[PDB]
Amino acid sequence: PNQALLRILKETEFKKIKVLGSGAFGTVYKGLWIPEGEKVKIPVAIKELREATANKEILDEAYVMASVDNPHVCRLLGICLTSTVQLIMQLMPFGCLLDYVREHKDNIGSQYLLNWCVQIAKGMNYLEDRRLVHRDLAARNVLVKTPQHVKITDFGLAKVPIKWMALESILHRIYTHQSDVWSYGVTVWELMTFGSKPYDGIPASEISSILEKGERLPQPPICTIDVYMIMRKCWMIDADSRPKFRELIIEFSKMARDPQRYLVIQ
């Protein structure tokens, strides 16, 4: 492992200043990274995982998270191991993409939406090239660095997100790059509906019977048949029939050149 890519941070080297959010997983803080022997204060997010009841295996996974080098995947900048695991990475000031599209739905055009689809596919393709499976891709796990630069987060963990999972993950706990492609399709559906909840009101335990019957998320009103057919291909039962992320980059890149042709907005 290339240890230099991962900073092991002392408690004095970072400060939690404000709360970004909390859940069963833990708490994320906005803060500053103040490296010793430097004259800089770096805006960061600090995620403190819930205390659990060892260090060598954690660092091994952290080394992998620090080794990711792609503009559309968040990189682990540093770690602090105490009673808890604290993860430090660059602050993404605009927050998660799901909240972003909900807050800006009136003001989001077709080029923005298609560009995000390209960027998310590029990040996922990078993870696949690294033989890394995400297992939790969703619009809530894409962060907005600036409005046209998004990055995937929450990879490397090593409420189950049933509504984003491929059928084989629900039924057999099989997770592959092709099940990530299923989740990518749901994520695109979230963006194209401006943050709607997938299968809203349906209990998680009912989702597999919906998929088994051939029912799928509906075509978003702004989506032409061309865009929706890509999404539906992501939800085929046969995982090897779903698109590859490499193919998704190409297709959405083509559509981003003529966005008005493929999304009908306003």
Ligand X SMILES: *CCC(=O)Nc1cc(-c2c[nH]c3ncnc(Nc4ccc(OCc5ccccn5)c(Cl)c4)c23)ccc1OCCCO
Annotated catalytic residues are 136
Instruction: CB nearer to ligand X: give 142 or 249.
Output: 142
The nearer residue to ligand X, 98 or 248, going by C-beta atoms, is: 98
DSSP secondary structure code for residue 250 in this structure: H
| Tokens representing residue 150 in the block | 């998004």
**Minimum gap (Å) between residue 153 Cβ and ligand X:** 4
Beta carbon nearer to ligand X, 39 or 159: 159
Return all residues near 103 (Cβ < 8 A) that are at least 6 apart: none
**Binding-site ranges for ligand X (CB under 6 A):** 20-23, 28, 45, 47, 87, 89, 91-92, 95-96, 98-99, 140, 143, 153-154, 156-157
Question: In the bound complex, what is the minimum distance in angstroms from residue 30's beta carbon to ligand X?
Answer: 7
CB of 22: closest distance to ligand X in angstroms? 6
Contact 143, 74 (CB under 8 A): yes
Phi/psi-derived region of residue 196, left when phi > 0, alpha when psi is between -120 and 50, beta in every other case: beta
Per the structure block, which two tokens stand in for 40? 């800089």
- Residue pair 59/5 in contact (Cβ under 8 Å)? The answer is no
Rounded Cα–Cα distance for residues 150 and 153 (Å)? 10
Residue 200 C-beta: closest distance to ligand X, Å:
17
Closer of 119 and 153 to ligand X (Cβ): 153
